[model samples]
Target: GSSGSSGPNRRADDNATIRVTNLSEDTRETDLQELFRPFGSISRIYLAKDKTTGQSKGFAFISFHRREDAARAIAGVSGFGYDHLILNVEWAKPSTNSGPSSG
Candidate 1:
């Protein structure tokens, strides 16, 4: 589905960031970085975790330096492997509820 018309690189500037989900808890940030490094310059790598346990929550955010590279990563890693877990990557939406909140 990455090569779909509406997929990455439909616009210039390539400022989009990708979000990958459904990973195993054993997955590591370094593994994802290595998987994506050949595609583009990675800005940040965030593997979501359980707030209380500090364990990976099976998801991550990867910011690429270029949109084209992001697209390339999507194409290259669509069905990537890591400890037998296939990846599910997509364009990330910036968190809308980022403001400080009352606890």
Candidate 2:
């Protein structure tokens, strides 16, 4: 929670990541990783939240050491219920906050 530019500086490819669209309460770092950690090594684990309320945005991004493992996680976990809701996992779609959709 630093203001001087602190975020994940990773060695893994950002493209080798997935966005989990459906999640539950208090989705912390350890909680999120426990799901995908079974599949492979983790490159990163992040929670999308509303800092304004300290609440979840119902989504998170998980980066894996290998994309193949990411796919594996999708097949195994997506559509599977957790915390009373299905986990909707998909490839992360990156969009800049102030940029056009065209990349």
Candidate 2 per-residue lDDT over residues 26-63, each given as its tens digit = 56778878888889888898877666898877777788
Clashes of each: 0, 0
- Pick out the ten consecutive residues of candidate 2 with the lowest summed lDDT: 1-10
| Top candidate, metric TM-score | 2
Q: How well does each candidate superpose onto the true structure, as a TM-score?
A: 0.69, 0.71
Superposed model 1: Cα runs more than 4 Å off: 1-14, 93-103
lDDT of 1 by residue, 3-63 (tens): 2123234232236578787687667888888889998778888776655998886777788
TM-score of model 2 vs. true structure: 0.71
User: What's the lDDT for candidate 1?
Assistant: 0.72
